[PDB]
């Protein structure tokens, strides 16, 4: 057993947080996808005696039919994991030119400890493509699943141009969110994105706040 | 900008009249009436400024329009007889 099993348990644990979240974006993923158990896992990703083996893990995800009817111009996703701990320049470019050359809209890296900053240039280098960098070990857990944490719903250009007119909002008039914040990075919410919060209330029963990207 | 006026189809305040519009209008009245304003209602016996103003009130002979502003500036005019005074 020694501390492998956990090594593999919590890749995993992580893996399925992947899967949720690259489904909540809007993609299609469907619940067997994510609900594949610890066993099933082993038996896929696991090498000559039954180590990790990330390298076969990275996949690709398409847009569901109805997110392409809110947000149409959202394209392909591509998922990444690494098996070096620390991932160089060299395994980057690499990434950088698969997402260049499938014509790939976004994508996401899943390091196991660190990115140099000589690969993490490479990152901003190739727009209309937008690069996501996530850590291994914060996906663990999936942070949107707690109590405290409500519903976040990323707002097409329509359902924000329609709020803002609504309301005879200003764009900064808006409670605003950070760019940095867990559900923010989460959904891959972009500056001027606007979030609508659904939460429970012991005045109403729900009650709705919107958060405008920084 | 004469935009600012939002007209009387397409209202969405309150049909029914703030708590602090009848102190003002009542006071408002009241001052207007306490320097010799021209008083539209049959003051029954009354004197006192304040008492004529909520009789003038309670019979919606009052000639104020309330100016109701938005957080941007527009305004909704709604007049003192077409306003709700279940208070």
Known sequence: DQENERNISRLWRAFRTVKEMVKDRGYFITQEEVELPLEDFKAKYCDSMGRPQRKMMS??????????????????????????????????????IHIQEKNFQTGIFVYQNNITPSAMKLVPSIPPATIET????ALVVNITHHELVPKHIRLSSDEKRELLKRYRLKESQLPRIQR???????????????????????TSGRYASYRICM | LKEKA????????????????????????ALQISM???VFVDLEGETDP??????????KKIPLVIRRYLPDGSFEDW????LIVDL
């Open chain 1, 59 to 96: 996949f690709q995800a398409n847009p569901t039919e109805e997110s392409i009817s809110k947000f149409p111009d959202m394209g392909s996703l591509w998922v990444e994991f690494c098996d070096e701990p620390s991932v160089g320049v060299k395994t980057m470019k690499t990434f950088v």
């Open chain 1, 134 to 137: 996530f850590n291994e070990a």
């Open chain 1, 180 to 202: 940095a914040d867990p559900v923010a990075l989460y959904l891959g919410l972009k500056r001027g994105e606007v979030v609508k919060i659904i939460r429970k209330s012991e």
């Open chain 2, 6 to 29: 939002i007209p009387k189809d397409q209202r969405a305040t309150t049909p029914y009249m703030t708590k602090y519009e009848r102190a003002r209008i009542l006071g408002t009245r």
């Open chain 2, 36 to 38: 010799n304003a021209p």
């Open chain 2, 50 to 59: 304040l008492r004529i103003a909520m009789k003038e009130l309670a019979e």
């Open chain 2, 79 to 82: 007049s003192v007889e077409e």
